[PDB]
Write a protein that holds these residues in place. Structure first.
Motif, mmCIF file in Angstrom:
data_model
loop_
_atom_site.group_PDB
_atom_site.id
_atom_site.type_symbol
_atom_site.label_atom_id
_atom_site.label_comp_id
_atom_site.label_asym_id
_atom_site.label_seq_id
_atom_site.Cartn_x
_atom_site.Cartn_y
_atom_site.Cartn_z
ATOM 1 N N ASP A 157 38.874 -7.198 -6.512
ATOM 2 C CA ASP A 157 38.554 -6.718 -5.173
ATOM 3 C C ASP A 157 37.536 -7.625 -4.486
ATOM 4 O OD1 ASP A 157 40.273 -4.496 -5.235
ATOM 5 O OD2 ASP A 157 38.750 -3.210 -4.311
ATOM 6 N N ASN B 265 38.482 -9.944 -1.257
ATOM 7 C CA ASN B 265 37.699 -9.810 -0.035
ATOM 8 C C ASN B 265 37.133 -11.152 0.413
ATOM 9 O OD1 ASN B 265 38.265 -7.151 -0.495
ATOM 10 N ND2 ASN B 265 36.135 -6.459 -0.589
ATOM 11 N N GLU C 121 38.153 -13.090 3.860
ATOM 12 C CA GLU C 121 37.111 -13.285 4.865
ATOM 13 C C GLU C 121 36.688 -14.743 5.082
ATOM 14 O OE1 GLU C 121 34.129 -10.260 4.400
ATOM 15 O OE2 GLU C 121 32.806 -11.175 5.895
ATOM 16 N N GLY D 163 63.592 -3.196 31.291
ATOM 17 C CA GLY D 163 62.949 -2.080 31.958
ATOM 18 C C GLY D 163 63.122 -2.263 33.452
ATOM 19 N N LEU D 164 62.101 -2.749 34.152
ATOM 20 C CA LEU D 164 62.399 -3.446 35.393
ATOM 21 C C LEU D 164 63.310 -4.622 35.081
ATOM 22 C CD1 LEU D 164 62.194 -3.920 38.366
ATOM 23 C CD2 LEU D 164 60.000 -5.085 38.031
ATOM 24 N N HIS E 132 59.811 -19.273 42.185
ATOM 25 C CA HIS E 132 58.701 -18.740 41.402
ATOM 26 C C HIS E 132 59.173 -17.819 40.281
ATOM 27 C CE1 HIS E 132 58.273 -14.389 42.159
ATOM 28 N NE2 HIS E 132 58.909 -14.641 43.288
ATOM 29 N N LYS F 246 45.423 -15.045 26.744
ATOM 30 C CA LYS F 246 45.619 -13.614 26.571
ATOM 31 C C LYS F 246 46.761 -13.374 25.605
ATOM 32 C CE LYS F 246 45.932 -12.542 30.652
ATOM 33 N NZ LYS F 246 45.665 -12.627 32.115
ATOM 34 N N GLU G 165 46.767 -11.742 21.928
ATOM 35 C CA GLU G 165 47.569 -10.558 21.656
ATOM 36 C C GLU G 165 48.296 -10.685 20.325
ATOM 37 O OE1 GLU G 165 50.219 -10.075 24.936
ATOM 38 O OE2 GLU G 165 48.603 -10.002 26.422
ATOM 39 N N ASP H 66 47.349 -9.534 12.671
ATOM 40 C CA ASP H 66 46.173 -9.138 11.888
ATOM 41 C C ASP H 66 46.202 -7.698 11.372
ATOM 42 O OD1 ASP H 66 43.736 -9.384 10.632
ATOM 43 O OD2 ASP H 66 42.548 -9.058 12.448
ATOM 44 N N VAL H 67 46.871 -6.796 12.086
ATOM 45 C CA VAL H 67 46.888 -5.400 11.658
ATOM 46 C C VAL H 67 48.164 -5.116 10.871
ATOM 47 C CG1 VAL H 67 47.979 -4.547 13.764
ATOM 48 C CG2 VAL H 67 46.599 -2.996 12.391
ATOM 49 N N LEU I 122 27.747 -11.872 -0.239
ATOM 50 C CA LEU I 122 27.694 -10.565 0.405
ATOM 51 C C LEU I 122 28.728 -9.614 -0.193
ATOM 52 C CD1 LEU I 122 26.534 -8.630 2.301
ATOM 53 C CD2 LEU I 122 27.662 -9.770 4.223
ATOM 54 N N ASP I 123 29.944 -10.112 -0.395
ATOM 55 C CA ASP I 123 30.996 -9.300 -0.993
ATOM 56 C C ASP I 123 30.694 -8.974 -2.449
ATOM 57 O OD1 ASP I 123 32.482 -9.278 1.375
ATOM 58 O OD2 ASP I 123 33.559 -11.114 0.837
ATOM 59 N N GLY J 212 27.977 -6.736 -2.803
ATOM 60 C CA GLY J 212 28.403 -5.507 -2.164
ATOM 61 C C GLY J 212 29.177 -4.567 -3.066
ATOM 62 N N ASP K 287 61.820 4.145 35.459
ATOM 63 C CA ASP K 287 62.649 2.961 35.331
ATOM 64 C C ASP K 287 63.570 2.784 36.530
ATOM 65 O OD1 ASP K 287 63.378 0.679 34.008
ATOM 66 O OD2 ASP K 287 64.890 1.644 32.742
ATOM 67 N N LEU L 180 61.454 2.687 39.741
ATOM 68 C CA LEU L 180 60.499 1.612 39.488
ATOM 69 C C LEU L 180 60.567 0.551 40.577
ATOM 70 C CD1 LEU L 180 58.338 0.441 37.833
ATOM 71 C CD2 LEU L 180 60.007 -0.242 36.088
ATOM 72 N N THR M 283 31.086 -4.032 3.234
ATOM 73 C CA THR M 283 31.710 -5.315 2.913
ATOM 74 C C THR M 283 32.996 -5.199 2.092
ATOM 75 O OG1 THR M 283 30.931 -6.048 0.728
ATOM 76 C CG2 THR M 283 29.295 -5.897 2.495
ATOM 77 N N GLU N 131 33.419 0.637 -0.763
ATOM 78 C CA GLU N 131 32.119 0.932 -0.172
ATOM 79 C C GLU N 131 32.310 1.767 1.080
ATOM 80 O OE1 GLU N 131 29.171 -2.461 -0.004
ATOM 81 O OE2 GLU N 131 30.912 -3.550 -0.780
#
Ligand SMILES: Nc1ncnc2c1ncn2[C@@H]1O[C@H](COP(=O)(O)OP(=O)(O)O)[C@@H](O)[C@H]1O
Ligand SMILES: Nc1ncnc2c1ncn2[C@@H]1O[C@H](COP(=O)(O)OP(=O)(O)O)[C@@H](O)[C@H]1O
Ligand SMILES: Nc1ncnc2c1ncn2[C@@H]1O[C@H](COP(=O)(O)OP(=O)(O)O)[C@@H](O)[C@H]1O
Ligand SMILES: [Mg+2]
Ligand SMILES: [Mg+2]
Ligand SMILES: [Mg+2]
Lengths: 526, 526, 526
Positions: A76, A80, A84, A305-306, A316, A345, A349, A355-356, A506-507, A510, B255, B259, B385, B389
């Motif tokens: 673990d 970690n 990190e 959608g639109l 354009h 942006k 995104e 990441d999740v 730190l880990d 920890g 929609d 829309l 960390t 924990e």
């Protein structure tokens, strides 16, 4: 629930410590220039060879469930640390063991291990502070090659090639690493927005040299649906011939009468169009075409959608690109114009997406390379004469890459393990609230010596002699364990990114300081 | 049915008591500031670490079926206590063991364990009375931070942050706890009615700074069905342009032609509309749209029963909000006007729902944060960390939160084990009907001493010396086991909510006194 | 068939008797005020504790197949007794063992166990005769609380609450029992015809206080089909506005144009209508609407066979109710007028259904609860601090309830066990036809002493001293085993319903006397 079995006190602590000590002992042989490799059996294939602490740690589960608890906690920490920071893994393991051992040993009846944990954490805050004081941000790109070469276990060619890629793509640009077929390393650099799709017809070719369709200052049309035309293309062609610019068309497919109009207007009255299939496939292709839309500017046609319909286009709604090159296999678009705000942006995104999310559906990275290709991207094709070699080497290259990024983004500090050693006096000026916290600070104080003594011990030398000689010596000097003698550290190139030295400690502290708090262990019966 | 095996009397009682004693012995090491943690193996992942009595208790099942009977009953106690109060679990466990042991030992021939049960229950009623007399309702928000910090095992930052959240959201407002990605704790406060759905089109954006649609004094239109048709969209816009206010539209989707009208009137007239998808899950979205309806004042369109059709709207059929902010990802509505009676109705309805048996499909809580969000809600992103924990700490934070709510809704009383200790004289003035009841009252009288003896014993000191010194000492003073000396309790901050002290004792005695009535045990054969 | 193994005579009899003796010994510890509880392991959950003889008896199966035969027969006895009477279970068990032992022991070579059976059956007929002579029918509602409190093992609050419910609902009214969430017992009383369905529209509301629609002297319209009308609804409204009475409408659903007519006629001219969904579960709702039809006087519309159509209504096809109250969640109808003959006919139909219908789709009781008494129905929400406690207490209250019903419907007789003891002289004046029958009568004669001696033995005293002291003493006096001394029985309140004393003995002797006839037993091989 499931029938279970429980154990009490220093007996169980000694069991868990046996597990910790086994795993740590396995990981620790890899440490430093004179470190050594660990072979791991693979279930299906030929065995892995590695010098990576975390990959060794992840490979070791244990039959004895308590020892396995220790092992699980140590992997673990190593995991970690790898997540990190991407290096400093073996270090995180040996620190975690040191804190766990020195922790467990100091426990008695009157002792309060949670408070000892508090003291340890105090000590870790106090050390990382002084570490940040020691940090000097990277400047010359020689230092980059140094951090890379040390993190790559002394392979100078690795840190050279990493230095080159990082120069030509940028310090916060995209570098990725993959297998070569060549016996040697290769650096390839891609610029643009490349993807693996080619012209639908040979008739689009203009240069006859290479057989490419080459365009500049071109328009791009993006259609999420197939174009087997109801002549929804013709206004898009009239608008292109109007402003006398070449047009590239990206679509799910270009088909039927559409294509016939395209290569009639192409072969006759020499109009400048090319058409290519969408990058694919299914729902991924939607995200890709919208990516290219945002990058090259303009808008994607077909139903989201639109609905924007192909019959009603305006200039354009298309897109604008500096250059375009397409062949039978792949298409590259270059210097596409759009809102840079909107592009950053977008990449922000996708990173927050990937990441999740965790299915090893790696195409989210394939997105990231594409939309970030207008700075550039570097692919690191690693060589070698055999797959196992390629994998070990690639492990080292990825380590050096992550290390260079950590160095650039946070800083560099002394290598060897000296950086932690120099922080001991900062602990000496602490003000512990009680005996327990004092025990904690003592634990960290002993634990700081470990990485240097271990790197020396792997060398075959009297590591703890070397630690004390280093402590007696000046701040700038440490032990070059490969050369087998003391040197100026930074001058000789032995340096570690501050981020990894921070995160390992730190880990490790920890989880280990939490481990030392245990009094009862509960496990399943075999 | 299944073949079975039976055991008779004090022989079987000694086995069940062995199980009770094992589980209790495992749980009891966690108690108090000098208490210690228990590691529990997880089947799939890395092991849990915990200081929570109930989570230790639930983890321990036993091979010996009789001992397992004891264990199951004690974890019944700890679980009931955790459900009814959210802290006081270890205490309930050690109390339960004390009543079970002292109970079992006192039974003989001619004895009437049912009547003894009646006596202990008399004693517990008599104790809880005097506890309520001792109770002093909370006043200063320093006391909040005290209850929180003691229930969080001495972590001052936890009770500080809880005090802040409870101030900024109110003492009976909504606080929730979740994982940080940060290494430190964070308090976030949400105001409004937030949900994770964004504008359908970019064209709705108003500020260009942040890329948001920002409105004030706006109306809201709520549609349970899709809105594609022009016919049902247009009157809602004419009525909106009439009263010169911005309009937000929430629907299953918006929609088709609708829309197109929306972003045409948006781009030309510069009409102030935004449209967003319903929060979106099958039957849940109906309940959510009804929530936002009731909160913003107004009604939902589409089919419930009474169908109100979108073609016939009136200004009192819409919704009215002080402010609204929308982005690509989320929508927040603020200061919506409606009957406070009706919203308090809605919240009283959802809590009484949640309170029953629909289980761990916790969107029912996600509803409750939303409609209670116009006072506020607090999110507690706890750091650390490493995942283990984070989970231990989050266990402690949830404990302290439940403890603070128990404190605000009921009273507070002396911490340590003193609150129960002071109730003994109330037992001394009882009038037992017979020898059995007298035995019960004696059992409770001994059992009251236990929690203090355990908190002290964990410290490494002579707990039963400390209990008697406390009893000899005045009512306001008790033993600070962390500081290792006697002090005024309330002044030093050592205090427990009365609700948890009540519930631990009531549950523990409630189950254990029933356990002592057993004469025959029947179990399945292996 | 399956391979088998057989056993002959007193050897096998001793085995079956071993099983009987084991199960009886387990059951018998629960008996009387000083009796004790039995814990039974549950496969899935936390273990049961019980004082119920039958629930102990069913829980015990045995590995030894012969002993298991004995056990199965004894649990057959306890189960038959519980079904036929609802108490007197432990008594039936100890009686059954006594008859089985005393039976088995008296057999020889010359003996004729069938004829002995005939003799015991003679003796029990003769006993229940004298029991019926002893019976004094219940009068004061103090006696109710006495029978309840004694059958509930001395819990006065139980017999008080049962006395209250039985007063407020009537002696042959419906009382049902279920878990509270409260820590204390609650008596709730429902009057009417309540079911869990609410108004389709808020607009139907009359009273702003509670948000209810409240009506009196109202009509009822019952439709088995949906009313999406078609305007098959309008004559039903014209007929209602004609006789100036409020109309409640119960239907599968009411919606389309129907609902629009309903809430237009409601909101403009002040018409008094409500519409609510049918109680609603497929084929169940049909039976429910037929119930409400029969109760409120009138008829159900839509498809049964003969179809009554909604367009052709008459006032005698509707329904008539004293009062009606409806909310968002539930609907209650009160004092509905119809043929009392037809309603009791209906109840007689459903009881005779449920009785044969071993289905455990127990909503048939929800029907029986719905078609309401005379004086109403009572819900008994039992409290306690834990599920196991709740199940124990609920077992005891169910016992006391069944006991009170047996008392009101047949009679009361002396408690302790004296009622069976006083029947011995009736046996003394018998005229046995032969030695075998004489053996039977002797068996019953000994067996009658058992329950009193057992209740005393559980007390810790010399039970067989006490039985003989009781026999030497007068008819009105017996042994108060809780108070530990002799008293007037009826005066002190220690009394048993005659029905349970009859059924326990009749069942026990009935099965055991058959058991004693066995000479060969045949069982499956393991
Ligand atoms: N020539 C050297 N002299 C002294 N220390 C070295 C030398 N080369 C590498 N190191 C040290 O080895 C450590 C890296 O060990 P490595 O095997 O990469 O383990 P990890 O996976 O924990 O980084 C660094 O702390 C670095 O200071
Ligand atoms: N410094 C202290 N001195 C004395 N008692 C303390 C101290 N800190 C905490 N306690 C006591 O410890 C108890 C809480 O222990 P805890 O581990 O939370 O068990 P539980 O989960 O059963 O509440 C409280 O009754 C509190 O009064
Ligand atoms: N205080 C008392 N004194 C004497 N007999 C009692 C007393 N209380 C209950 N009993 C007797 O105990 C018997 C009830 O025992 P119980 O445990 O209910 O067995 P069962 O479940 O078979 O009815 C009754 O026959 C009653 O006469
Ligand atoms: Mg490395
Ligand atoms: Mg606690
Ligand atoms: Mg009974």
């Amino acid at each position: 629930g499931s029938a279970k079995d429980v154990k009490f006190g220093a007996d169980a602590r000694a069991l868990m410590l046996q597990g910790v000590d086994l795993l740590a002992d396995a990981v620790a042989v890899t440490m430093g220039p004179k470190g050594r490799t660990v072979i791991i059996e693979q279930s299906w294939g030929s065995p892995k060879v590695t010098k990576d602490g975390v990959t060794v740690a992840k490979s070791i589960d244990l039959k004895d469930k308590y020892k396995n608890i220790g092992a699980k906690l140590v992997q673990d920490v190593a995991n970690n640390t790898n997540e990190e920071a991407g290096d400093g893994t073996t270090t995180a393991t040996v620190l975690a063991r040191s804190i766990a051992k020195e922790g467990f040993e100091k426990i008695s009846k009157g002792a309060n291990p949670v408070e000892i944990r508090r003291g340890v954490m105090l000590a870790v805050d106090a050390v990382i502070a002084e570490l940040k004081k020691q940090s000097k941000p990277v400047t010359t790109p020689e230092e980059i090659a140094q951090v890379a070469t040390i993190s790559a276990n002394g392979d100078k060619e690795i840190g050279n090639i990493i230095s080159d890629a990082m120069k030509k793509v940028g310090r916060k640009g995209v570098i990725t690493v993959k297998d070569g077929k060549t016996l040697n390393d290769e650096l390839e650099i891609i610029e643009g927005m490349k993807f693996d799709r080619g012209y639908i017809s040979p008739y689009f070719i203009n240069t006859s040299k290479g057989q490419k369709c080459e365009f500049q200052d071109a328009y791009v049309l993006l259609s999420e649906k197939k174009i087997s035309s109801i002549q929804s293309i013709v206004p898009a062609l009239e608008i292109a011939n109007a402003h006398r610019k070449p047009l590239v068309i990206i679509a799910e497919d270009v088909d039927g009468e559409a294509l016939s109009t395209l290569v009639l207007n192409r072969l006759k009255v020499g109009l400048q169009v090319v058409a290519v299939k969408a990058p694919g496939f299914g729902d991924n292709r939607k995200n890709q075409l919208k990516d290219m839309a945002i990058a090259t500017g303009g808008a994607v046609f077909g139903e989201e959608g639109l609905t924007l319909n192909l019959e009603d286009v305006q200039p354009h709604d298309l897109g604008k690109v500096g250059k375009v090159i397409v062949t039978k296999d792949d298409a590259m678009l270059l210097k596409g114009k759009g809102d840079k705000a909107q592009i950053e942006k977008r990449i922000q995104e996708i990173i927050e997406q990937l990441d999740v999310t965790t299915s090893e559906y790696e195409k989210e990275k394939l997105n990231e390379r594409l939309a970030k290709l207008s700075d550039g991207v570097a692919v690191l094709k690693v060589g070698g004469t055999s797959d196992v070699e390629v994998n070990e080497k690639k492990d080292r290259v990825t380590d050096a890459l992550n290390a260079t990024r950590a160095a650039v983004e946070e800083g560099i500090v002394l290598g060897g393990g000296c950086a932690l050693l120099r922080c001991i006096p900062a602990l000496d000026s602490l003000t512990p609230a009680n005996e327990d916290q004092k025990i904690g600070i003592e634990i960290i104080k002993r634990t700081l010596k470990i990485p240097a003594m271990t790197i020396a011990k792997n060398a075959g030398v009297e590591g703890s002699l070397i630690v004390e000689k280093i402590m007696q010596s000046s701040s700038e000097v440490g032990y070059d364990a490969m050369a087998g003698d003391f040197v100026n550290m930074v001058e000789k190139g032995i340096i570690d990114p501050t981020k990894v030295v921070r995160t390992a400690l730190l880990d490790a502290a920890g989880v280990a300081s939490l481990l030392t708090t245990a009094e009862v262990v509960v496990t399943e019966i075999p």
